[PDB]
């Protein structure tokens, strides 16, 4: 009960945590010309 060699690696981080509404996934626009989407 005093051992740390085999502790869970993912448990050292903060414990705990279908379409993304803000992701342009079905919009076919080049990533280098994204300024056309600026609100202006």
């Amino acid at each position: 009960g005093e051992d740390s060699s085999m502790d869970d690696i993912s448990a050292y981080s903060s414990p705990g945590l279908l379409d993304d509404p803000f992701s342009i996934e079905d919009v076919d626009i080049s990533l280098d010309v994204l300024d056309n989407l600026a609100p202006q």
């Binding site: 919009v27 076919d28 626009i29 080049s30 010309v33 300024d35 056309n36 989407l37 600026a38 202006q40």
Partner: protein, 97 residues
């Protein structure tokens, strides 16, 4: 054949294909992304800017309504048709008129 490594011919042979520079009056497809309407790709008559310090695609402000474009930093594609078949159809079908 290159043009710099070939300078011994007085003229050209019939049937050859010449890849010439783009001149004023040529038609070109002119596009802005995203292409939502079918007027987002239109055919414009090219006016070649002889000033070597100009690097932008200049167009009339009244033509922005086709592409939903403005001059806050937008970038637009442009490809000049070279095939005869595609050059005919640009003038007759895809013209911005």
């Amino acid at each position: 054949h290159d043009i710099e490594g070939l300078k011994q011919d007085f003229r050209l042979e019939v049937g050859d294909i010449l890849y010439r520079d783009v001149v004023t009056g040529d038609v070109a497809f002119f596009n802005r992304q995203p292409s939502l309407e079918r007027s987002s790709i239109g055919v414009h008559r090219i006016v070649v800017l002889e000033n070597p310090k100009i690097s932008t695609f200049q167009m009339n402000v009244s033509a922005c309504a086709w592409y939903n474009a403005d001059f806050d930093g937008d970038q637009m594609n442009l490809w000049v048709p070279w095939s005869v078949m595609s050059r005919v159809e640009a003038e007759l079908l895809c013209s911005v008129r």
